[PDB]
Amino acid sequence: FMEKLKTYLELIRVKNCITASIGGIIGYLISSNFEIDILKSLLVFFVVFFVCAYGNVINDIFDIEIDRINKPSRPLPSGKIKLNEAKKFSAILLILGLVLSLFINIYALIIAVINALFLYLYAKKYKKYKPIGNFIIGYLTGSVFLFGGVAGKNVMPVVILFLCSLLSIWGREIVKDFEDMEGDKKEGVISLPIKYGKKSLYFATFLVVLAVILSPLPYILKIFGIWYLILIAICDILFIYAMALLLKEPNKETASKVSKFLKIIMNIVLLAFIVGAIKL
Amino acid sequence: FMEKLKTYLELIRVKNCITASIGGIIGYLISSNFEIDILKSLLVFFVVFFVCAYGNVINDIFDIEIDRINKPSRPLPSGKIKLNEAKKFSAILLILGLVLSLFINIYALIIAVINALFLYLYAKKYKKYKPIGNFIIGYLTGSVFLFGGVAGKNVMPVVILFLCSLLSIWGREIVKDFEDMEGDKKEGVISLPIKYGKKSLYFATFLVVLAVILSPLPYILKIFGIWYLILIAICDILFIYAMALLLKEPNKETASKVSKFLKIIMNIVLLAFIVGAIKL
Numbered sequence: 001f002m003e004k005l006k007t008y009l010e011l012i013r014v015k016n017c018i019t020a021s022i023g024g025i026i027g028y029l030i031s032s033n034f035e036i037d038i039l040k041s042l043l044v045f046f047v048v049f050f051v052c053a054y055g056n057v058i059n060d061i062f063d064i065e066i067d068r069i070n071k072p073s074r075p076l077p078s079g080k081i082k083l084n085e086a087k088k089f090s091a092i093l094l095i096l097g098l099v100l101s102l103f104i105n106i107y108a109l110i111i112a113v114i115n116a117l118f119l120y121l122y123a124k125k126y127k128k129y130k131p132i133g134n135f136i137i138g139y140l141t142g143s144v145f146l147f148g149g150v151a152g153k154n155v156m157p158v159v160i161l162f163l164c165s166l167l168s169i170w171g172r173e174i175v176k177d178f179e180d181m182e183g184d185k186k187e188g189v190i191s192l193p194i195k196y197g198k199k200s201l202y203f204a205t206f207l208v209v210l211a212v213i214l215s216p217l218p219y220i221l222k223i224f225g226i227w228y229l230i231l232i233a234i235c236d237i238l239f240i241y242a243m244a245l246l247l248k249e250p251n252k253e254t255a256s257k258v259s260k261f262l263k264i265i266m267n268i269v270l271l272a273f274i275v276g277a278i279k280l
Numbered sequence: 281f282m283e284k285l286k287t288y289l290e291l292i293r294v295k296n297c298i299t300a301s302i303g304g305i306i307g308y309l310i311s312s313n314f315e316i317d318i319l320k321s322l323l324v325f326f327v328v329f330f331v332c333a334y335g336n337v338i339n340d341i342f343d344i345e346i347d348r349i350n351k352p353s354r355p356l357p358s359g360k361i362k363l364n365e366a367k368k369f370s371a372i373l374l375i376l377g378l379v380l381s382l383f384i385n386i387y388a389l390i391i392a393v394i395n396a397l398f399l400y401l402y403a404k405k406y407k408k409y410k411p412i413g414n415f416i417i418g419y420l421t422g423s424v425f426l427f428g429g430v431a432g433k434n435v436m437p438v439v440i441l442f443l444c445s446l447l448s449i450w451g452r453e454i455v456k457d458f459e460d461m462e463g464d465k466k467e468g469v470i471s472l473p474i475k476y477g478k479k480s481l482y483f484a485t486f487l488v489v490l491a492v493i494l495s496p497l498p499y500i501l502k503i504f505g506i507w508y509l510i511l512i513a514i515c516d517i518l519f520i521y522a523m524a525l526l527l528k529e530p531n532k533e534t535a536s537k538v539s540k541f542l543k544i545i546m547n548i549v550l551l552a553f554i555v556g557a558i559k560l
């Protein structure tokens with residue numbers, strides 16, 4: 001049972017779930033301006049944990065055949081957990097996630113249901129179909145914050161965080177698909193760069209540009225102050241500059257550098273929302 | 281320069297420093313009962329970060345020759361950083377750590393100075409001399425909490441956390457040395473299980489038993505309540521049981537299992553201290 005617990009924790013990818021759950025607490029902290037309720041905190045942390053755990057289990061279930069060749073040591077291809085045990089377990093995690101969100105509010109239930117639908121469909125077919133898949137990665141990463149946000153008293157700045165995360169991550173996913181063009185083509189993967197070439201980079205630029213337009217809104221709405229504004233101004237210029245560089249040099253090496261750079265900026269933007277929330 | 285920064289962050293082991301710094305904030309949170317001051321919490325986080333970073337750099341400096349064999353991708357054996365650049369850098373980190381602790385209080389300066397002395401001497405000679413080295417690992421792990429504790433208003437429960445951490449980790453280090461006897465002997469390493477045989481396990485038991493005796497004190501002193509007590513009672517019985525098992529079967533396989541088990545219990549004890557404090 002010490003080794004069986006190790007296997008179940010490996011199937012749900014417990015560190016990935018904890019990371020997503022901290023994301024949900026971050027959304028809750030911003031929304032409540034650090035005026036944190038412990039019952040509400042536990043509900044946010046565990047709804048995110050269970051829905052994320054469900055997403056990881058449903059991913060392994062659909063990937064059992066692929067993993068038999070690629071990652072044979074995973075819980076399902078190795079035979080340490082039976083397919084039918086994993087399917088029963090995925091149902092439990094989902095029910096716990098959905099039932100716990102009923103104790104937050106209707107907005108939390110809607111997010112939980114939408115996430116569950118996206119997670120199943122991503123695992124089932126959209127992981128390989130990048131035009132829809134890129135959007136799902138963006139939506140799911142951002143929704144984790146929104147989940148904590150709807151539990152708090154002031155969700156508006158978290159709505160902006162969610163929207164900026166969705167758009168910029170969706171944009172960055174396209175940049176990554178441009179970098180991985182050769183390997184994806186010889187793998188039966190469909191993506192915007194494979195289907196449209198360098199034109200896809202204009203759509204990635206558009207998504208980064210909408211995210212930049214929304215970014216000063218918490219300051220404009222008088223929710224956050226000067227520190228948020230200064231950090232967001234630096235990050236907004238760096239986002240535009242990074243995409244202008246990719247558009248001037250549309251190649252694999254540049255897409256790789258821009259992808260790494262956008263990841264760093266996104267983390268500084270997350271810090272800016274936290275710093276803006278530190279208004280106590 | 282992003283690659284040179286990457287090399288410096290690898291040299292200080294930035295994730296290890298962040299972990300130790302969170303340890304310091306945990307000590308501060310317990311001591312102040314979550315009534316956290318932002319200037320005090322930045323001082324605690326950064327003094328711990330800089331002293332920890334210094335410890336990691338001084339370790340790599342003394343290990344430059346050994347690392348050419350044991351870990352050759354590290355910044356100093358690989359040549360990415362020169363020895364003299366690392367020595368200058370270690371001096372900066374130390375000065376920043378010591379100077380920042382002056383802005384906390386005299387207790388923080390004393391801990392910072394003691395830690396710096398232990399870190400240098402551990403890297404210089406005591407890492408290989410396990411009778412003293414085991415104690416240094418125990419003291420340094422526990423001191424991180426004590427560092428945050430002395431910044432807060434109620435250090436007493438953190439003194440107990442520090443003392444229990446020191447004793448149990450020192451005890452666990454001996455169990456680990458018993459498991460690694462063969463490999464240590466053929467490497468010119470001196471340790472209590474090499475010097476004395478199974479008798480060293482009585483000294484490891486003594487340290488654990490002493491940690492167990494101190495553990496109910498935050499409840500006895502009326503600092504923490506029922507939840508702390510229940511968790512500590514379970515953990516105390518498991519600690520005694522684990523050592524009794526090792527004393528009945530003093531072999532490599534049992535020492536290995538007991539070492540892993542003690543690590544889990546120590547983390548539940550940390551949770552008990554957090555929970556005790558969370559009862560504001």
Ligand SMILES: CCCCCCCC/C=C/CCCCCCCCOC(=O)[C@H](O)CO
Pocket residue numbers: 005006007009010011012013014015016544548
């Ligand atoms: C009240 C206290 C009760 C606690 C009971 C004790 C249980 C703790 C024991 C578990 C330790 C073993 C961890 C298993 C590793 C799986 C990580 C899986 O790794 C990951 O997350 C992926 O690498 C992410 O991609």
Ligand SMILES: CCCCCCCC/C=C/CCCCCCCCOC(=O)[C@H](O)CO
Pocket residue numbers: 018084085086088089092093096
């Ligand atoms: C901070 C991190 C906190 C960690 C908390 C993690 C909690 C783990 C989740 C518990 C939900 C209940 C599921 C129980 C397992 C049942 C086996 C399911 O398997 C089956 O259905 C098969 O038939 C196996 O026999």
Ligand SMILES: CCCCCCCC/C=C/CCCCCCCCOC(=O)[C@H](O)CO
Pocket residue numbers: 039040042043046100103104
């Ligand atoms: C054997 C497998 C182990 C499975 C363990 C499952 C863990 C479930 C964890 C959920 C978090 C509990 C938080 C408290 C809920 C309060 C709702 C009460 O509601 C209220 O009164 C108001 O909504 C408060 O805002």
Ligand SMILES: CCCCCCCC/C=C/CCCCCCCCOC(=O)[C@H](O)CO
Pocket residue numbers: 095099102103104105
């Ligand atoms: C095949 C399995 C079929 C599914 C079975 C599900 C398990 C049983 C659960 C049923 C839902 C009942 C919970 C409703 C209480 C909501 C409290 C309302 O709480 C709130 O919203 C607070 O007041 C805070 O807003």
Ligand SMILES: CCCCCCCC/C=C/CCCCCCCCOC(=O)[C@H](O)CO
Pocket residue numbers: 105107149150151152153154155156159
């Ligand atoms: C009129 C039906 C609309 C149909 C659905 C269209 C989907 C498109 C919506 C996208 C925007 C998502 C953010 C809104 C969350 C606000 C929750 C609100 O949360 C709250 O009110 C908090 O509890 C308080 O802070």
Ligand SMILES: CCCCCCCC/C=C/CCCCCCCCOC(=O)[C@H](O)CO
Pocket residue numbers: 137141161164165168169208211212215235236239263265266267269270
């Ligand atoms: C001013 C413009 C707006 C700024 C927008 C910044 C967003 C704020 C914070 C977002 C959270 C950080 C996520 C880290 C990036 C990795 C995405 C996770 O996806 C991935 O990389 C994986 O492939 C997942 O499968």
Ligand SMILES: CCCCCCCC/C=C/CCCCCCCCOC(=O)[C@H](O)CO
Pocket residue numbers: 216219220232233236237240241244
């Ligand atoms: C409440 C007030 C609202 C404040 C909001 C923040 C303002 C920042 C907005 C971003 C503007 C777009 C970035 C400029 C283009 C960068 C390429 C510039 O091109 C270049 O790199 C040159 O060639 C220099 O080498």
Ligand SMILES: CCCCCCCC/C=C/CCCCCCCCOC(=O)[C@H](O)CO
Pocket residue numbers: 264268285286289290292293294295296297
């Ligand atoms: C407010 C402005 C923000 C500042 C902008 C600076 C950008 C940050 C860039 C980070 C580059 C990542 C390299 C880190 C690798 C070293 C890990 C080495 O650590 C480890 O792997 C462990 O410690 C060992 O267990």
Ligand SMILES: CCCCCCCC/C=C/CCCCCCCCOC(=O)[C@H](O)CO
Pocket residue numbers: 293296300327328329331332335336339391392395402416417420421423424427
């Ligand atoms: C005034 C409070 C300041 C904080 C004090 C310094 C941090 C001590 C906390 C960490 C516990 C580990 C102790 C082992 C010695 C570290 C050097 C050896 O380092 C290493 O190379 C590692 O083994 C790598 O994992």
Ligand SMILES: CCCCCCCC/C=C/CCCCCCCCOC(=O)[C@H](O)CO
Pocket residue numbers: 381382383384385386387389393
């Ligand atoms: C081989 C090396 C030998 C090592 C010997 C150690 C060096 C001893 C030197 C003395 C410096 C002590 C400074 C104390 C001044 C008070 C700080 C200011 O105090 C404060 O932070 C607050 O005011 C008190 O709460």
Ligand SMILES: CCCCCCCC/C=C/CCCCCCCCOC(=O)[C@H](O)CO
Pocket residue numbers: 025038041042045543544547548551
């Ligand atoms: C190999 C090493 C073994 C590791 C040992 C495992 C430790 C045992 C952990 C399980 C206890 C879980 C308690 C629930 C708190 C987690 C969310 C915290 O809840 C929240 O969201 C907060 O209340 C927010 O402030």
Ligand SMILES: CCCCCCCC/C=C/CCCCCCCCOC(=O)[C@H](O)CO
Pocket residue numbers: 298302305306547548550551
């Ligand atoms: C095993 C026993 C259970 C212990 C679990 C308790 C969780 C820790 C609780 C303490 C509060 C955390 C405050 C630290 C914030 C700084 C991280 C910010 O770090 C940074 O700045 C980094 O760049 C992040 O990547």
Ligand SMILES: CCCCCCCC/C=C\CCCCCCCCOC(=O)[C@H](O)CO
Pocket residue numbers: 013016020047048049051052055056059060111112115119122136137140141143144147
């Ligand atoms: C209502 C709030 C619920 C919480 C939201 C759950 C979604 C998890 C959050 C992170 C999104 C980033 C990863 C993209 C999802 C891919 C499925 C995950 O599968 C995978 O790709 C691998 O198994 C792990 O890399």
Ligand SMILES: CCCCCCCC/C=C\CCCCCCCCOC(=O)[C@H](O)CO
Pocket residue numbers: 202205209212213240
């Ligand atoms: C108070 C002062 C604030 C005012 C500053 C305004 C800055 C707002 C930010 C965005 C401007 C940058 C546009 C870059 C996209 C151009 C590609 C567009 O080209 C394309 O991709 C087309 O397909 C070409 O036909």
Ligand SMILES: CCCCCCCC/C=C\CCCCCCCCOC(=O)[C@H](O)CO
Pocket residue numbers: 199202203206
């Ligand atoms: C409050 C939020 C505001 C929402 C505004 C909605 C904007 C309308 C949505 C569609 C934008 C299409 C992306 C354009 C970039 C692709 C290159 C240019 O594309 C084209 O024109 C050709 O297809 C060639 O690529």
Ligand SMILES: CCCCCCCC/C=C\CCCCCCCCOC(=O)[C@H](O)CO
Pocket residue numbers: 220221222
């Ligand atoms: C087919 C129809 C589709 C309609 C689509 C509509 C798109 C809306 C576009 C986005 C702009 C919204 C910004 C609102 C902030 C106004 C300042 C408000 O003033 C302030 O800053 C106050 O102090 C805060 O209340």
